[PDB]
Structure formats: C-alpha cells, structure tokens
Amino acid sequence: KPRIPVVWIHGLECTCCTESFIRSAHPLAKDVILSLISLDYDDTLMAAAGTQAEEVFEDIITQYNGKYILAVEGNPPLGEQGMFCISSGRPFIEKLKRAAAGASAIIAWGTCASWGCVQAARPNPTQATPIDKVITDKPIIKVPGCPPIPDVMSAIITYMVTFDRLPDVDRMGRPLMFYGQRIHDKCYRRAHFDAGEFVQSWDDDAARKGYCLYKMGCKGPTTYNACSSTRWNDGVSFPIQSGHGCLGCAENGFWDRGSFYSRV
Amino acid sequence: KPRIPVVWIHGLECTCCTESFIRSAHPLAKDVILSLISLDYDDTLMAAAGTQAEEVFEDIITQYNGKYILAVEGNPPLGEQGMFCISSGRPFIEKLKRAAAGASAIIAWGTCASWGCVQAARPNPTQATPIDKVITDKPIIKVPGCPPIPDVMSAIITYMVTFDRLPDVDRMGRPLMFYGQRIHDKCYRRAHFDAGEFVQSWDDDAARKGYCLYKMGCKGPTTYNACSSTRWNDGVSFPIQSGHGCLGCAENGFWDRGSFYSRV
Amino acid sequence: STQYETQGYTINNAGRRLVVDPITRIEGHMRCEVNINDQNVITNAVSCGTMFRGLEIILQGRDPRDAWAFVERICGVCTGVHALASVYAIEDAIGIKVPDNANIIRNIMLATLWCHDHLVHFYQLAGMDWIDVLDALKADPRKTSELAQSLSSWPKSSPGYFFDVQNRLKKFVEGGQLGIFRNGYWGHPQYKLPPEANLMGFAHYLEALDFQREIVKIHAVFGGKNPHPNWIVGGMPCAINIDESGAVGAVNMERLNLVQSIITRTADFINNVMIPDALAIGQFNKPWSEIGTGLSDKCVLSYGAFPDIANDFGEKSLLMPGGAVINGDFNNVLPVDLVDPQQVQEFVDHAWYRYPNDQVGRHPFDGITDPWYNPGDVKGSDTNIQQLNEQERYSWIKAPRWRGNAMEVGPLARTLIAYHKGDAATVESVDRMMSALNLPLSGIQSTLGRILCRAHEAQWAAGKLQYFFDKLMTNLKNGNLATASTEKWEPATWPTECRGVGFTEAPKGALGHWAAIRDGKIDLYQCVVPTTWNASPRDPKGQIGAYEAALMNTKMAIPEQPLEILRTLHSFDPCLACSTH
Amino acid sequence: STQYETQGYTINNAGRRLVVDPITRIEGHMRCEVNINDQNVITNAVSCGTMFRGLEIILQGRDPRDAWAFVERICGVCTGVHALASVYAIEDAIGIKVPDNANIIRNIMLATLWCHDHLVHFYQLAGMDWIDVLDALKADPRKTSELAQSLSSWPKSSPGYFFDVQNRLKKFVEGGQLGIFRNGYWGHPQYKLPPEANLMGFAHYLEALDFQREIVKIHAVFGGKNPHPNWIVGGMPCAINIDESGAVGAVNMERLNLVQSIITRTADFINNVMIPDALAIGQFNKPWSEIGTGLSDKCVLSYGAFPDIANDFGEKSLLMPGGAVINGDFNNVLPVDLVDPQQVQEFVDHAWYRYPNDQVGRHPFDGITDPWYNPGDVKGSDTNIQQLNEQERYSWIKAPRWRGNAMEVGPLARTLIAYHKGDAATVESVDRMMSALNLPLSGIQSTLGRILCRAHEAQWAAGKLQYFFDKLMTNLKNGNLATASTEKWEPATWPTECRGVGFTEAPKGALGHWAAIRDGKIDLYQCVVPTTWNASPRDPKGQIGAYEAALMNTKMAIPEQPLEILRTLHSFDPCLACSTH
Ligand code: SF4
Ligand code: SF4
Ligand code: FCO
Ligand code: FCO
Ligand code: SF3
Ligand code: SF3
Ligand code: F3S
Ligand code: F3S
Ligand SMILES: [Cl-]
Ligand SMILES: [Cl-]
Ligand SMILES: [Cl-]
Ligand SMILES: [Cl-]
Ligand SMILES: [Li+]
Ligand SMILES: [Mg+2]
Ligand SMILES: [Mg+2]
Ligand code: NI
Ligand code: NI
C-alpha cells in the first residue's frame, strides 16, 4: 500500500533537527523511511542534486498536490530581499511558499521553524522569521526544541500515520502529548528544589549529589518539553541529568531572556 | 591475566537476583562472566551437577581460600534444623558457613540475603534469617531490592574489579553510590507531590497525567535505592514511571509495614 | 529392596543407588536419586524438592489487593505468572471485570514471559546437555559458517564471527579458569553434535544471553521493571494517554513504539536462532525421540490460557487450549474444572506435611500447608540424608493428581492437548516439524519432544505478542483507553465471604491459585504450580509423577556422570521454588 | 569570457556553463557552477555558499560564559565542536585552566563526534556517489555473502541477510515511491562496483544509519543530549561521584560502564564495516586516486587537536598534529600561530561583505562581519540568479588564506601533515592502506584519498576514545574527580580587556574562534571554520580555494548529470552552515 508523501525543506538552519530525527530509537529512522512514510524530497539525504533535485521537487508537489505533508527545518530571512538563503538562484521563501501551497499540513521542526532560534536572537541580522508569520493559510504543528527529542519526532510521525490525524495541540500549535507539561513539573531534581538544595558553583558537593540547578540558571520552570520524562538518546540522559540547567531551548525567544546562568 | 574468583551460592530464594544480573546492559553479563570475573560456582548456570558440582565447590574454596568473593542469593532457614533448605543432603547453612570461611568478602544480593524478604514476612514459617545474623566475621556488602537493579549489580561488580576495593557503605552495609538517597528524593513526580496533585483511584485523570502515587501507597519516601535515577532494564522504566507506587522492596521488613496501598 | 508395578512401570529399588544433589541448571533446590540394574538402566527414580518457604502461610491475613506482590516472589524465573494468577483469583472471588486493554496488556505480559523463559531455558539451562562447549574448540570456522547458513537466514554467520567466538572461548579456557564449564560432562558419548554444530550452538548461547535482556523491556513499559513487575486487582496500573496534556506521565506513543520494536526483534531472534537450533538438536539426537516418554503417552493436563475475550475464561476465549487426557486415550480430551473437589487434589503421604488423614487427597479449597520435616531412616540422620526413603516422606513438594491420575504438564502436554482437540495451527506445525525430522508423531512424546515443543511455543508466543499489540492499538484508535476497573477496589464493596480460582499456563505448565476471602482478608491461599505436578512424589497407590516416570527405564552410559538424568529433568524446565512455594 | 593562470591552473570561463543548485547530501546551502570545454573537461569552477545567519554579530554584547551555547548552533552535524572551540577561546582570554578530567572528557566528546560525523558522511552523504543502489537489485545474495566474508570478520554476512536486504529494497521501489533514490544517477558509467559490492554497500548504509544513533550516547552521558550537548567555561558540568552518597545524581560507575560499552561497539563497527568498505571503494575506483587533487599536493593546513596535557596546546601535547605545507613542499611542515596577524587572514573582495579595503586580508582579531548582498552583473537578476559573476562578489563564504596562500583543510590535510611530521601511527596506517590498493603515496592526494583518510580517522578516533576513557578511569582510581575550575567564573574576576583563541580540528578541518572580552561582554567574536577554508571564493590575486581547485580539470561523462562534481565536493564533507555561520 502507498506510503504518505513527505516533502522536507530546509531554510536557514544548522541541520540539528534532521540529525535528531535519524537518532530515533523506536521506530528506527531506517524503518520510518522504508516502511512508514515516503520521504520524497530532502536535501540532506537525497541522491539527486541540482536540476535532478528540482525535477523531484516539482514532480512530487505536482503529482501529490493536496496530499503531502510538508516538514520545514529552519526559517526564511526577510533581509536582502530573502537572498540570505538562496535555493536554485532564488530566495528560499519562494520554495517555502510553493511547497506550503500544495501541503495537506505543515510540521515546523525545531525552534528555528517554530519561533526563530539562534539566527533570530538580537540583533537578528537576516530578519529570520518563523514559518507561521509567512504561511498563514495552512495547519502548522510546532515541534520546538533545539533540536526536538529524536523519539518525540518519530512518535509524532507514528501518531500521524497510525491514527490518520494531526496530534492535538496547545494554543501555540505544540503537540499536547509531549509539550503539555513543563520540564520542572517532571524533573527528578524537584525534591532538591523544594528543600532549597542547590548547586552554587560547578562541581561543588551539591553538584556531586545531583542537587537542583535553579541557582545555576536552569530555565526548566518556564520550559515545556518532554526532556525530564521521555529524556534524550533512548532515555540515556537530558541536560539537567548531566549537570547543566535547561537553557529553555523549546521556548520562543529563549536566547534573549538573559544569560543562561541568570536565575529564572 | 587471572580473573577474580567468585563463588555464587543460593539459599531459600526465588532466583530473581540471578535473573536481574543477567539483564545487565553495560557491561553485558556475558562480558562480566568471560572477561571481568571467574564465576567458578553457580547452581543456576554451571554445567556440572551433583558430585561433579560438589567437587568444583570444594576445589575452588580450597584452592582460592582467602581470595574469592562469595555472592549469596537467598537465605538460610533455622527451622527444622535447617532442613527447609537442603544442599547435598545437609542443611544449606553448612554450605554457607564453609563458603563464608574462605571468602575475602561477601556480597548479599537482594532483600532475601540482606534482610529476609518474602519468606521472612509474618509469620516466617521457616525462620528465614539474613546472612549477617549467621556470618559475623566477614565483610558483607548488602545490595537490597527484590531484586536489585541489573545495572546496579553489574556496576558494583565493575567497581570492585576496577578499583580493587569494596564500595563504601552506609551504617546498614549498603553501597553509598546507589543506596545513599531515597527514591522520593530523585522522583520525577515530586513536583506533583509538592503541589498536592495525586492519583486517587487507578486510571483517573491524575493517573493519566503521571501525578504522584503517595495516596495509592507509594513507599518512595522511606525507601533507599536507585530506581528513580538509574531506573530499570537499561533505563526503560521503574515502578512509579509505569504507574504503581514503590512497594518499599529495598527496605528491611517492607512486607510487614502494612498494605502496599496504605499511605507512608 | 522391594518391587511393585504402577502405570506400566516396574519400580525396583534393588541395585546401585545414585544421588544427584544438587541438580544444577534449574531454578531452586532439587535432589534426585535413582537405582540402576546390572545393565545400567534406571529401575527406580526419586524426585525431591529440597526447599520450602511457605507463601501459602504468609498470605494468610493479607489484603487481597496485595496478594499478587507476595506470590509473584514464588519465582523470579517465571516472574509475573503468579501475579497474573493472583489478580485472576481475587477478581474471580470478588466479582471484578477488567477493561479490555488491561486484559490485552496482561496477555502481552504473559506472552513476553513465555518468550523470555523458553529462550533462556533452551540456551542457558538445557543447552549444555546437548552442546559440547569444549568440543567447539575443534571446529572449523568456515564449516561452522556453512552449517549455520544452511539452517537459517540469520545474519550473524561469517567465518570470522565463528573464529572470533572460538578464540574468545580458547582464551577463556587457556588459563584453567573454566568457570561454568568446569568439571562438565564434555566428551561423554551421548554428545553427538559435530564440532561445527557445537561452535554454532555456543555462539548462539552467547547471543541469547545478550538478547534475552531486551525481551523484558516490554514488562518494564507496562509493569515498571523485570524481574517482578507490578500489577493491580482491577487491571493494570499503566494508565494510557496518547493525545492529551501530560502523556509524558503515561503509556504514550513513544512507549508503545518501544514495545513494537522489542516484539519485532524478539520474533526475529526466536524464528531465526532458537527454532533452527532446536531442529538441529533434533537432527543430531533422534534416539532421544524414544527416551524419557514418561507420562506423556498416558496422562497430560492443560488448564488453558490467554483469554482473548476479556473476563471470559471459557473454551471459546482461551487462545491456548485446556483439557486432560488419561489412560493414553488421546481421542477423548476431557474438560477440567478447578472448583470440582473430585478433580485437582494434593496428597502428602510421601511429602513433608501434616494432614489429619494422609491417605486422602485435598482439593486446594480444603488445602493444608502444615510443614513436617520427617525423613524417616535416610541412612544418615535428619541433617544428613545419604539416601531418601521413598517408602515414606521424601520431598517438600506435594503430590497433585487429577481425578486420582498422575499427570504431565508443560509445553509437550499443551501441544498434545491442542493437537488432539484439532487446533489447526498446532496440527500443521507438529506434523511439519516431525516430517522435517523423518520421525513419527509418537517421537514428540519424549525428552527431545519436550525441547521441540518449547521452541515451537516460543515462536507461537512471539506471534501472539504482535496479535495482542495490534488489538491494543485498535482499541486506542477507537478511543478506548481504559486500563483499570475500580468499582470494587474498596473492601467495603466486597462480599463478606467469597472464594475464587485464578488459572493460567505458565511456561512450565498448568498453574492455579485458590483464594478464600473473609472480612476483607485472605483466609486461605493455596497454590498448585506446574513443577508441583511434574516433580511430584508418590501417592497412597504408589503412583509416580512425571519426572520419576520419565527417568524410569533410561540407559546410562557412565553411572557416575548423570548426563541422561540431567537431559530428561532439564527437558521439563524444573522450577523448584515454584514447586514448593 | 576571460582566462587567467593561478596555482598551475588555467581558469577559463568561455564555453558551456553548468549550474548545480541545490547541492544535496551536504549540510546547508551550496551552489556550484562550472564551465566545461568541448572535451567535457571543467575549465572553471565556482563555489558559492547560499546562506548566512550572522552568529559573529549576534554574539556581540553577550556574556562570554554563554557564547558556547550560541555558537554550538552554527552546526548540528559537527555538533559540539564550536562549543569546544568557544570554551577554549574564553578560557584562553580570561586565563582559566580546567581540571584534567574536564580536558579528558572534552577529548572524549571530540573523538565521539569524529567517529559519528565520519561514519554518517561515509554512508548517508557520500556513499550513493560510489554505490549504485538500484544495481544492488541485480546482485546474487550468495556472491554478496562471499564478497563480504572475503573482506571482513563482521558477523552480518549470511546469504539470507543479503537476500532480506535486497527484498526490502525491491519492496521499497515496487510502488514507484523511490524517495531519496528518485531521479538519481544510477547506471552512470562512473558507477564501477559490481552488483554484489553495491548490495554489500547498501546493506552497510542501513546498518550505519541504525548504528550511528548509539555512538552519540557518549555525548548524552557527559553532555546531556545529542545533538547540541552542554559545556561550561571552566570544564564540564557533568560532576563525577563514584563512591559517595548521591552518586545517583552524577557520573557514576553505571554511567561510565555505558560509555565503555559504546566505545567498544563503535570501534567494532568502524573497524569491521566502514574500513573494509572504504578499501573496497578504493579497489573498484582506483582512477579516482588521480582525480580531484586540487590543493592537496600544494597547500594543506592543520591547527592540531586533542591536547593530552591539560591546558597545554603545544606540539608535545596535541595528539593530532598541527602544521602547514605550502608550495608543495611536504619536507617543510611549518608551525602555525593563530595570533600572528600575517598568518590567518580573511578576504572579502569576492564575498558578500564590506571591508574598508577589500584588497587586503584581515586577521580575525581585526575581523569584520558587515553583510552586503551585491552579486553585481549576474546573468539574471539579484533575486533570480542564472549565473553568478565570479569576477565580482559571489558567496556568503569569506576567503581565508594562510600567509596569503590558499589551503586545503580536513582529514586528507591532517593525514599529510601527520605523515610528513613522522607520526608513527599515521605513517604505518597510510602505508598499509596504499600498499593494499597497490597505489603510490601520491594516490591519497585525490578525491578517493579524502574518503580513505576519513575512514582512517574514524578508526584513529575510535582508538583514542578508549585511550581517553582509560585516562579518566586512572584519575578516578587515584581519587582525582574534579571536572570544573570556578575561581574565574564570576565576571568581576576577569581582565577588563582580554582576548583569546580557541582552536581544534573539527571533522572537516581546522577550526578557530577568536574572542575579545571588554567590560564583561563579548566585544568581538570571529569564527573561521573548516568549510570556510575549503569552499572559499577567490582573493585579490585570483587564487582559488580547495573546492574550486579540486573541480578543475575534471572530465564529465554526461554534462547534464553532475556525478563527478558531486563525488569531489562530497569528498570534503561540505558543511555550509559552518562555512558561513
Ligand atoms: S533542576 Fe531545573 S527543572 Fe529540575 S527541579 Fe531544579 S529548577 Fe526545576
Ligand atoms: S510517586 Fe512516590 S516517590 Fe514519587 S513523588 Fe510521589 S510519593 Fe514520592
Ligand atoms: N512456569 C513456571 Fe513457575 C513453575 N513451575 C510457575 O508457575
Ligand atoms: N567539522 C565541521 Fe563544521 C565545518 N566545516 C565545523 O567546525
Ligand atoms: Fe535542526 S535547525 Fe538547529 S538551530 Fe535551534 S532549532 Fe534550528
Ligand atoms: Fe533474587 S531472590 Fe527473589 S525474593 Fe525478594 S530478594 Fe529474594
Ligand atoms: S535546554 Fe532544551 S533539550 Fe530540554 S532540558 Fe531544556 S528544553
Ligand atoms: S518497589 Fe523496589 S524496585 Fe525500586 S521503586 Fe520501590 S525500591
Ligand atoms: Cl529545501
Ligand atoms: Cl526563538
Ligand atoms: Cl548453592
Ligand atoms: Cl525483609
Ligand atoms: Li589556557
Ligand atoms: Mg501448594
Ligand atoms: Mg567568520
Ligand atoms: Ni518458576
Ligand atoms: Ni558543520
């Protein structure tokens, strides 16, 4: 039986969300690509380049008009007439608009596509702009994080294939399943927060006992994600477990909320 | 280069600690057996039986007198002159004392060897007795839990091999590395405990959001172990993560502290 | 010395007495004694459970909701099966019906345990009876690769792989620290595999030791941990949340994806490693299709298991058939009723227990567990058993009978019941398996048959895991998330007095828990466990149990080296902690 | 049209223009244009970075302690290396020395990233230039098994395995949904592997896609997550506790055990899968030892990496050597000083930036990042480019030079520097590799050589992972646990004005971050990244960068199918987000 067409495009980005996706432990990204979806365009992985890649893009968005999922990594820059990000000699934004017009639904992978991420941090030299300020007539599912958790990305994809519908979202368009609760509301160091048991300098005795990272700038109290529950890299760790406070990397504007080491 | 000799004996037990040991993810139990120790006696896994197994036991404790680690799973019963547990026609306690006399140190695996576990629960029909009430002249490391965590078992073995010393222990003989803190002091549901957000009946809306299990009888607040941090089965879960309160299974006398569903 | 006739056997305790104590590569504590005649053939066999803990006594006075957690600790090998039987028994007593997802998840827990228990038993417990590990050092790695590739599509077959495994074994042995291989039976004439098959089997022993840890990740997802996962009366505690806020605190799509990944890998390992190895052991050891028949051509018992209709324990629901055969009449598979006082009864005239009348058998609702260590004259002392006295009390295991008949339980028993009830999948699988070996159907009623049936069951259970997972996902697609019924959670809702039976097919065979509740507490809790049947001592008629029968009439090549005794006992997967509880 | 001479090339833009935009199977955005003569030979090559974000502008005014987290997001492929260069730069500026275990763990993070990046590049990015995936459907599974087993001890080689892989590919393409294989170059005459080697390589593509996720578990232990782990100025935040209360809150023996398990598996995969596949691509594609030389026989550059003596960045400390070769004189490996204003400079006369004088180069402590999109007289228009004008500004990539010379960086560059400095392990490895191919040492200075060196480096880094792990455990055995220096953590402890250089060898080559701190804030932060060097546009002398030079003089079989262009560009592992930052 045919697999759901997916077109994956890349604006200004660092490719972390693509790398996250391929870390998926269950299902393996191999099995997502071979058996669950038809990944029909993706600059990172596809054989074709140049005019052969342009032909794939055109062929898929034409033949599967109205029927493909558009995955977007990164964002369009409005500066220099969009030519801070060029594809096939034209502004990236034109490729984003063409791909968006034929899509059934749009997944905004990562904080870049969702909100702006590092290139939109002050002073935003390129005028990098999240997808939902350019595409205003299509369902957009925001999957924020820098990058989002590998097994969250694959679980969102399996949900859509298995249940044949988009995940239910909060008022910001984030899937309730993984973004409904704050990091701090499922943090294994919360006992120490509640007791006033804090790391005060790196590698102090508190740090060596896994005390709370609030006074070291942890932004877990204002960050919605699944890092303290689902965790990272097949459950191996997450930022706080390995001794660094949450940066707040799933939240809009997290680069410009003051130092990562200044308290929430 | 010779590997440290280990003699593993079994009193009254269910064999859960042996099963837990073979679950080890890192190092694999295979590599512990082939590369890290010489597992020279173990009724569950050894080729020899009967007189051939008695020959191995006698040869190893004689040849390596003073130089082997004795691992003990289960416990001796003092009832019926010890014949609630019979080894080569004689009370198990006799084999325990012979093995203990030649050991450099003893690992008491599990709540059975450490404290008593289920056979010692009221009314203790066999007079099941923990190892440290019988063997009083040897170092005994208690590794409690029903069973202890697989990767905790293998980490204690690798510590002893790598560092050539016993783990440092608390006042009850438990390794500080894995038993120094309570389950409730590293529990990812502690935010809900602090907020008064409790499961009140199974599968209620609170249970479906991962609220705290205190009112369902969780004994995390009085239990020392690594289940809420290291977790179980290669980090996949632990009791509370899958929706059941801690039973208290690492603590002495946990079967007789009231109903598992009565509050701490 | 004496002689008497029972069940077609001549029980004769003349001749040399051999003692095997301890039995190793089992769970828990067992002693076996035999007598052999001048042709080194067993004419008497004595099965002895050498441990007791008293869970039936400890359960008195507990809260019925807690019982599962206590009785789970009957055994860490068949971990979970006693918890399942317990929640079934308490739900049967009170009158609780669980939601469909709880039933499906319980079936997943049980199928997971079947896969894990059968695989570890094949390799780590029984395998070294069939594979001469030290002989693997003589194998040619290229011929090993060729053999493996002829039997399976399994990827891991390169000559360099088999050379690396062989070299690891060589370096292990070279310093004389042979560990679990020390003082083994290596080179015994009953080891019949060629060196290449020994090296293939040894490589797979190591692969299975690694892989088995992954299977129980399913128990960790739904049950928190393995060994000894968690359960509740009323369903399971693993609340589901797929598409709502807080799914991070519940069984969500990521958790289910983990379960699916394990199922696939579990089927792949069993189908391409364990199944071909079982058929290879059969190909090289065909004479063992005629050894250790015991009661398997006389009397076999299954209660049945895996209710596919939630809260329906009837024949149309159970995916694993129940029934009994006696007197070798496989054309009349009889129905089993665990409430009927004339069906399951336990005797103690040859066991270390007190009854008011030791000449009668007690149904478990009339059960008594009053320990009485009384070995009589054992040619030593009460604390030095040199020879058990099988004319009197000789075991901590009670003697279960069905309508007075001594029965075999377990994979071979279940396979014969399903085959003779005309289960299509079973008939086709068994006929194809025995055809592949160029053996008659009767060859399954043997020590080799017990091993082949266990491998067949691991494959069946790996298939059923996917079936159950798909059933769960269908319910979630339809918005049916419920995992617990709590209408009768509170003791004020229970009957003042009630009783119930929980039953299933554990990996070793028919399991039952009989519970009576009074005034909110356990008044009586009696367990009859598969190894209790199989390892049973004698009854007032002198009838012998499954192990004693299977050992009768067996030739031993070398009396002092009990390889043939170990092969047959290990073929039943003895679980002595289960048997005694 | 114009023609000029530079570096032994005739740059001629007469004749047919070919455009490749987008370049795929890279990170980020690249455009390439070439001119080809009547003989289908490239006479002109144009490297264009088609993205910019401006991290150097964004970092102004930030707290130096935060800088690593911003610049880490230069790239998610080489994730971590910019964080490492950043903490090195800030520590160099302020005068911070980290504890030994922090340095060892940073070396582990870098070695982990080398293994991961090199493996994924080999299979997922470059592999399909060499392996004809659709030709794998014609292979014989038994001949594929025989080939794989002739090359490697790797276990996963059974005929059934290769059949199963082949059938998965056959099923994938059967619905006409070819996904990433659609409209590829399959059947191009430059595909030289036989069908069995295609199927072997395709099977390994899938094994590598699965296995790469495990490598980065080492990043998750020490750095919390991958991609984009966490770091600190002063060391690492992953406090260690082996034997004290609360070790469950720190890097403990169980966490170190997980790291060791990953190291062994990573070495085994690289040594037995990637290494033999790289040699097989060499054996079937020997002509590519003479194609794509570019600058690799003229000018190569390494800064060096992996300081083994904590806080010592000198030649006696760095385990991966530094040095520069110019003028093709490999007898004169020159020392590199990243503070010397006459050594590293960047030019922008051919890039989209403003300088006060675009005819001179600026050392990064004098760097300027003032973006100016001015493509001038293109064919087309400024928002619809048909042809860049390479006689004016044509890229978002600045043009770095070393003492005015255009240099190649990356695995081939490092291999040549280490070989010609007499590093014993490098000389042995390279000699054994080129002996196995029957090729002269000059064969490494090529497109094929860049791939062979990358595979050699993955093996080197997997070995170093064990070395560093063992050093860490030696410190812990000695009671040396420290992972952070905090005496200069607070801004009031810093110099009011200071500057520093942080440098390393990222997987793609020489990386530097130049930072100036004033009044507690970043005053200047300039990055020069390895793909900045390799993908560089021209300078005021018209000197071409490594990509443009490696493309010069390349024959194309089919002008409309850029397979040869992709082979040579992919051999450098282009990271365009890195190049532009
Ligand atoms: S470490 Fe961060 S998320 Fe966790 S309890 Fe402390 S402040 Fe909250
Ligand atoms: S679930 Fe148990 S251990 Fe966790 S916070 Fe609640 S009471 Fe404490
Ligand atoms: N299987 C199993 Fe254990 C036994 N006998 C139980 O029940
Ligand atoms: N490696 C890598 Fe990325 C590039 N170029 C960096 O630094
Ligand atoms: Fe995966 S591209 Fe990486 S920067 Fe923060 S989300 Fe963006
Ligand atoms: Fe591992 S034997 Fe299992 S009962 Fe509680 S520890 Fe005991
Ligand atoms: S920094 Fe990001 S990865 Fe999770 S812990 Fe905080 S949201
Ligand atoms: S029941 Fe035991 S396994 Fe851990 S969570 Fe509680 S100590
Ligand atoms: Cl794109
Ligand atoms: Cl943002
Ligand atoms: Cl023992
Ligand atoms: Cl206890
Ligand atoms: Li320094
Ligand atoms: Mg009983
Ligand atoms: Mg720069
Ligand atoms: Ni059991
Ligand atoms: Ni990069």
Explain this structure to me?
The complex is a heterotetramer, with 2 copies of chain A (264 residues) and 2 copies of chain C (581 residues). Chain A is an alpha/beta fold. Chain A has 2 domains: 175 residues, NADH:ubiquinone oxidoreductase-like, 20kDa subunit (Rossmann fold), CATH 3.40.50.700; 84 residues, Cytochrome-c3 Hydrogenase, Chain A, domain 2. Chain A has 9 helices and 7 strands; from the N terminus they run E-H-H-E-H-E-E-E-H-E-H-E-H-H-H-H. In chain A, the strands form 2 sheets. A 5-stranded parallel sheet of chain A has the order 2-1-3-6-7. In chain A, helix 1 packs across helix 6. The longest helix of chain A has 14 residues. In chain C, strands 3-4-5 form a 3-stranded antiparallel sheet. In chain C, strands 12-13-14 form a 3-stranded antiparallel sheet. In chain C, helix 5 packs across helix 6. The longest helix of chain C is centred in the middle third of the chain and has 32 residues. The site of one FE4-S3 cluster has 14 residues of chain A, from helix 1 and helix 5. The PDB classes it as oxidoreductase. Keywords: membrane-bound hydrogenase, oxidoreductase, NI-FE hydrogenase, hydrogen. It forms a tetrameric assembly.
